[PDB]
Amino acid sequence: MALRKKNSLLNMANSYVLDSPQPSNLNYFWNFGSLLALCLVIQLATGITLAMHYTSHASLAFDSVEHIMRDVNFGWFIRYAHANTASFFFICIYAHMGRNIYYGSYKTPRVLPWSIGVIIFLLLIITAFMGYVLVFGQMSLWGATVICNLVSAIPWLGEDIVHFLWGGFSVGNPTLQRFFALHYLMPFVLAVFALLHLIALHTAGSSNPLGITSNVDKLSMHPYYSFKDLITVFAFLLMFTLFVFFSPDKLGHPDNYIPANPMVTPASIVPEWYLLPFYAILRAIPDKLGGVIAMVAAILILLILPIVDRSIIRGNAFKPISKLLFGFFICNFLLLGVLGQVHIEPPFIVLGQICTIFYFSYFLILLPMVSTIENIFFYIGSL
Amino acid sequence: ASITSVVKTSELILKSPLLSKIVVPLAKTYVKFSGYRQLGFKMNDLIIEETPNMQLALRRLPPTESYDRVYRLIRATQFSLSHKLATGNDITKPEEDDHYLIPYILDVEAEAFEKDALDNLEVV
Amino acid sequence: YVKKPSYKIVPHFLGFNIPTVSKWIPIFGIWGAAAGIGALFLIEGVPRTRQDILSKIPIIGEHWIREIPASDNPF
Amino acid sequence: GKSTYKIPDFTPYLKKDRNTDANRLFSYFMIGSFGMLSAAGAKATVQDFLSNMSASADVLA
Amino acid sequence: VSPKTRTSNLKNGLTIASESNPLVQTATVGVWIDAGSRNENAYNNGTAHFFEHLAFKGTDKRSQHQLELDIENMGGHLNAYTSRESTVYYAKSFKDDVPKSVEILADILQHSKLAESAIDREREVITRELEEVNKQYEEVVFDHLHATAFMNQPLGRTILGPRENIQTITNTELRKFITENYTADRMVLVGAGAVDHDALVELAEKYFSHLPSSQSPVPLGTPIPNFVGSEVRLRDDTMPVAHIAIAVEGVSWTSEDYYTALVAQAIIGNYDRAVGTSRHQGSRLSNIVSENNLANSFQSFSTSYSDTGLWGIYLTSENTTQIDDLVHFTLKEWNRLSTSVSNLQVERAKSQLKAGLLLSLDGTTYVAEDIGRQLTTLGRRVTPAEVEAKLEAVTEHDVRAWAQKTLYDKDIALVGLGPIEGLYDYNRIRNDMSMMRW
Amino acid sequence: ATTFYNVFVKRNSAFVATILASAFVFDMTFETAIDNFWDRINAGKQWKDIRHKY
Ligand code: HEM
Ligand code: HEM
Ligand SMILES: CCCCCCCCCCCCO[C@@H]1O[C@H](CO)[C@@H](O[C@H]2O[C@H](CO)[C@@H](O)[C@H](O)[C@H]2O)[C@H](O)[C@H]1O
Ligand SMILES: CCCCCCCCCCCCO[C@@H]1O[C@H](CO)[C@@H](O[C@H]2O[C@H](CO)[C@@H](O)[C@H](O)[C@H]2O)[C@H](O)[C@H]1O
Fold first, then answer.
1. Would the CB atoms of B30 and A209 count as touching at under 8 Å?
2. Nearest-CA neighbor of C52 among A293, D54, F22, A160?
3. Smallest CA–CA separation between D53 and chain E, in Å?
4. What is the distance, to the nearest Å, from the Cα of residue A164 to the centroid of all Cα atoms in its chain?
5. What residues are in contact with ligand 2 under a 6 Å CB criterion?
6. CATH code of the domain in which E77 resides
7. What domain range is F20 assigned to?
């Protein structure tokens, strides 16, 4: 027996990266998983490096980031790499979630990897929010203020919990130092959950774009998907290069280059671009607590996809109506993103509410209806 | 959803003259646009099989039907990875798109649903 | 002479029926109490919990009405 | 030493009142006390430890 | 509607009980005795079973050979068995051969030779029986189960007795045993099938009239057992099938919970993969075991004695890597007798038992065994109308109450025989006797 | 004493509820008891003992 199978440690590696049996027809949208792993590795390496130069004290934090930009050898690169990869991490994670929704990766028997995935998505959001605060520019401070004030909505204990998060009566030094510690930690927790969702997946194996069993036709993970993953690694690195080297601040908010000032409030306090759809969902509900619940529900509702999809067929490759509905859902999610960054003005107020209703009605009404109808059309249609 | 549910609902529609007059033509167009026939699948090949019920139904297929199913799945997987479509004899013609599996899954489910009912019986 | 056994199917869902669930209703009650006692116990230190809940309990409630004398309080 | 139906001598260890409710209850009293002190200890540990995150003395000044 | 069981007494206190059936042509007469292994002490343990051998070894009149011939000439057969609490000696014959058979039974019980030469001969036969029961796994398991559950108590002893006693049983102690125990007030002459009651009472007055009466005549089925939660493992990796019994202290014949315990037993029920219908049984455990191939069989039992009982289940399995699951699921099904049973299960089990207790009696030997058992354990035959009423009185609430005091979180006696490596240690088995979720 | 078992111990829900309620009582009483004990062994030493001068 070959060593890679005999030795228990090697065999665990072998089972995931080498002999792992994969469907032979995975398309390029199955490459986001490895890109996300690459982002996670880049973020760990650049993040740990920034941590060697960053100072968490509010009196020094912003200046320590300037010191990294200006004084540390290649500090500019490590800083921009970390900041831009945070954006790419969300592009890739949305792509990965999009792939999973379109191809019905959330259906049995893959409910568990899907559900753990929803938690990974929440941890990524928390990680990225805390990391943004660490710069302690104007957007850092004001974003922390408004996002942490949402917890004030929790009845009875809300105010007390906010003071507890802040370690104080406003966002300041205690908040910054604790976010540093947690921002350092959270990516390791995220890595553990990412590993758990893979272990959960390994019982069923990857889905495939046809949505049929692949048990009939498997391919070793290496060399086939190893070399296929290289193509997207180099495509990713090209996109990374164009941002990091040529336009490092295209995805950034200029206000974050002004030191935090609790007195001056910036023109428009918006989250980072990847949180904007959730921000639009929050604004849609007039009630403070309602808004917070809706915003959380917009993420947690993904957990009910396994239930509300009533199709007898896995995924959308063969379902014309579901494909149209999915197209509208995705474009609406992008519109929500856009409405997250406009001013609270007519006519975007009403529009934001309509898009929010469309967002929720996809899970609660349209997907259950459309999936039921298509079941019937496949049966009657093939008689 | 259960295949039982889908089949019962479809039979309600095929009974009602009005309903069939408007639904049958739609469903035929839907299936044409669905395009699974272009990969040489029969409709039934697409049903989710990773369920205890469906594993049982597949085990009950006659050997011939079972071997042919495996071929269609392998062939379609190869078309998928090649980004090609079936041509000629590989395209499933409407007359070849037979519900080979539906009777087996309906029997498996019938017993499973009777079992659930009878587990809840109350002597009167 | 009996021609047929006499039975009904009771309404059920996900393998739960009303006869069975009704037997567990009391147990959810006790677990709810246990969760109540446990939660309240965990936040007994929170000042709002004392102010709004624990100090209002008859007899016992004076345990949580404690003032630092103004002579010993820097703040 | 040969018959397997002659149960070995357990009289040094057998409780005479082994099937009484008193007997079970006593062992559960020990388990329950241990659970009670573990709960009281955990609550104390959690409460004191997490209080580090409430405003420090310099902030409250 | 069955014919009435007629009951008469003699002067000495011998009970005669008969249930006539003018549809059949055979008759089973016999003597049920309220005496068995439990009546021995530790020194004479094995005597009762020893006597059973010698009873057929010749009497004061007929020699061993003459006895054989007399029964052969009758046409039917004689049979005997000794249990812990009951000894039976019966004779199945033709209708008009009943006077011969009662005469033969009276002879072998009262006037047996017990000749030193025959004691010595059987002493080897019985010694060889010690090394051949070893094959009858169900009995091996249940003998260890009694041994452990009633550790160092009379019920805990085997019927055969230790090797040491077999070598030292004398005709004196045999004589003393049957003189002390086989008394008229402890015996019931039973006839079922083609018997006239009045004819049987006359035969009893002819043959069993000079029976000794005991000094203190207590009623029939009058008895202190202290159950030990404990385990015996008899691991044998060469065996292909594991046999496991799990029991708790159950109910006596005269318990007020006797029918409740039967209903509970019927909720768990039996299963046998070799029977066609078993995959479709209503029992939850049956479903779990059949779907997962966890066992070859299981058999719930509720064994009763005069003052205690064992209630439990006996499992056989070839699935040696999933014995843990089998035992896990079994004990979780028992937990549900405490936590979950409702009118659904209870009414279904009552239906099954209302028939089952009558179905069992399908031949004259079974009818005689039923009359004999009931008369020696309860002092009367319980009519089917009373049985139907006692079962009807069992509610779901009664079953739950019984299980919560008898099963829930209780010590078990556990015996495993065979490839039982996968059976966890006592604690993990006993931990399944409660549910943390409840 | 069967009664006590049946009420507080038999159901785990009840047993855990009992343990947590006991922990609540213990925690409050132990706090008070140690406070008094500590003040007696450290009598005249602590601020509360000299505070009255000011
Ligand atoms: C750090 C973030 C993540 C990493 C590194 C990661 C990685 C991967 C990898 C490597 C795979 C197998 C290959 C692939 O299909 O692309 C995979 C599959 C999967 N991931 Fe993720 N993932 C992440 C986040 C998520 C999230 C947020 C979700 C869901 C909300 C998710 C749900 C899934 C599911 C359902 C599959 C199975 C899909 C299939 O093969 O059909 N993952 N992931
Ligand atoms: C999922 C992994 C991570 C994500 C998504 C993430 C995200 C971010 C983001 C969005 C920022 C704001 C960047 C800026 O605009 O300047 C940031 C800053 C920071 N992150 Fe992370 N981060 C990750 C992992 C880590 C790790 C493991 C460390 C290890 C300490 C770390 C340390 C830092 C530090 C020190 C800063 C402040 C310096 C700066 O702004 O560049 N990060 N992170
Ligand atoms: C992706 C990152 C790379 C590192 C790999 C992840 C580290 C953690 C992985 C271990 C978690 C347990 O993972 C589990 O391991 C065993 C053996 O390794 C695998 O077991 C599988 O492979 C071996 C042979 O290759 C067979 O004995 C077995 O029949 C098969 O199921 C499981 O399919 C996998 O689920
Ligand atoms: C899901 C878990 C629930 C949330 C956990 C709650 C976290 C924080 C809660 C209480 C923390 C602050 O709450 C406070 O605790 C400290 C002990 O730490 C107590 O303080 C008391 O003891 C400490 C030492 O033990 C003394 O320094 C103090 O003078 C005295 O008042 C306060 O009387 C209580 O009001």
1. no
2. A160
3. 35
4. 27
5. A 40, 43-44, 47-48, 50-51, 54, 65, 79, 82-83, 86, 89, 127-128, 131-132, 134-135, 183-184, 187, 190
6. 3.30.830.10
7. 1-54
